[PDB]
Structures are given as C-alpha cells and as structure tokens.
Amino acid sequence: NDIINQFLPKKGPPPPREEIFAVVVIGSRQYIVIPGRWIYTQRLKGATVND
RNA sequence: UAGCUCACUGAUCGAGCGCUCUUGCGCCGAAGAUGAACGGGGCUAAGCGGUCUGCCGAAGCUGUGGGAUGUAAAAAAACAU
Numbered sequence: 560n561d562i563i564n565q566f567l568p569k570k571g572p573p574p575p576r577e578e579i580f581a582v583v584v585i586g587s588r589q590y591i592v593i594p595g596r597w598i599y600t601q602r603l604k605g606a607t608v609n610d
Numbered sequence: 611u612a613g614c615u616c617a618c619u620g621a622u623c624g625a626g627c628g629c630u631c632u633u634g635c636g637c638c639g640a641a642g643a644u645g646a647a648c649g650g651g652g653c654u655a656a657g658c659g660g661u662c663u664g665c666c667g668a669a670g671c672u673g674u675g676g677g678a679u680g681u682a683a684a685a686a687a688a689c690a691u
C-alpha cells in the first residue's frame with residue numbers, strides 16, 4: 560500500500576476558501592470574483608507587480 | 611278583339627322606412643407555359659388604421675485600455691485626426 564499509494568495517489572482534499580463571491584467593475588466590464596482566484600483585465604495604468 | 615298585369619286608390623297589418631350621396635376596409639373584373647414560388651411555418655390576428663409605453667437593434671455614440679499621424683521643433687502632456 561505504500562507503493563500503490565506512491566504510484567497511484569488518491570485525490571487530495573480541496574483547499575479552503577471563503578464561501579463568498581462578488582461582482583466587481585473593472586475597466587467597465589463586470590467580473591465575478593471568488594477569493595483565491597486570479598483574473599485577467601485591462602491594463603491598470605500605474606500598477607506595478609506586487610501592488 | 612278578348613284575356614293577364616303595372617301605374618294610382620280604399621281596406622287589412624302596427625314602427626320604422628324610401629332614394630340619395632359619401633368616406634374606410636373588402637368582393638368580382640384578374641387567365642401560361644418544370645413545382646407551394648407572394649421567405650417558410652402558420653395566424654381572424656401573429657392583418658389594417660389611431661394612440662400610449664417598455665425593449666431589441668450597427669464596425670454609429672459612450673465606457674476602459676493600446677497604436678500612429680498633425681500640430682512639432684527632443685520627450686512627456688494635451689487637442690484634433
């Protein structure tokens with residue numbers, strides 16, 4: 560069972576997130592955002608990586 | 611010739627009715643050659659007028675980002691394109 564666990568792993572349990580979602584306006588489009596997830600948008604002018 | 615019948619009149623019946631226009635929408639006039647042939651299915655509105663209010667609808671206008679050309683002679687920032 561150590562071998563058969565190594566080579567055929569069981570699906571791990573899902574990471575915890577809050578049960579919540581929002582609908583937010585960015586660059587005049589509306590996205591549904593759930594926390595922990597990344598989305599694509601219009602360039603935000605004057606935004607730097609790690610902001 | 612006769613004969614039938616009409617115009618007109620008396621009577622009966624008891625509440626409307628005559629001849630005129632004129633709008634709107636229809637009917638007939640209207641019939642071809644490969645096969646519904648007029649978008650289709652269908653609809654008495656899901657057709658036609660008139661009025662009220664919602665919505666859909668484009669590469670138009672707005673929103674958020676990039677480019678370029680002209681001002682213009684470095685940029686950057688404007689405006690226009």
Ligand SMILES: [Mg+2]
Nearest residue numbers: 612613614615
């Ligand atoms: Mg006769």
Ligand SMILES: [Mg+2]
Nearest residue numbers: 642643644645
């Ligand atoms: Mg025929």
Ligand SMILES: [Mg+2]
Nearest residue numbers: 648649650652
């Ligand atoms: Mg039709």
Ligand SMILES: [Mg+2]
Nearest residue numbers: 658659660661
């Ligand atoms: Mg109408």
Ligand SMILES: [Mg+2]
Nearest residue numbers: 667668669670
């Ligand atoms: Mg459009």
Ligand SMILES: [Mg+2]
Nearest residue numbers: 668669670677
């Ligand atoms: Mg285009």
Ligand SMILES: [Mg+2]
Nearest residue numbers: 668669670676
């Ligand atoms: Mg375009």
Ligand SMILES: [Mg+2]
Nearest residue numbers: 669670671672
């Ligand atoms: Mg335009």
Ligand SMILES: [Mg+2]
Nearest residue numbers: 674675676677
């Ligand atoms: Mg622009």
Ligand SMILES: [Mg+2]
Nearest residue numbers: 677678679680
């Ligand atoms: Mg330029």
Ligand SMILES: [Mg+2]
Nearest residue numbers: 678679680682
């Ligand atoms: Mg220029």
Ligand SMILES: [Mg+2]
Nearest residue numbers: 679680682683
């Ligand atoms: Mg120049």
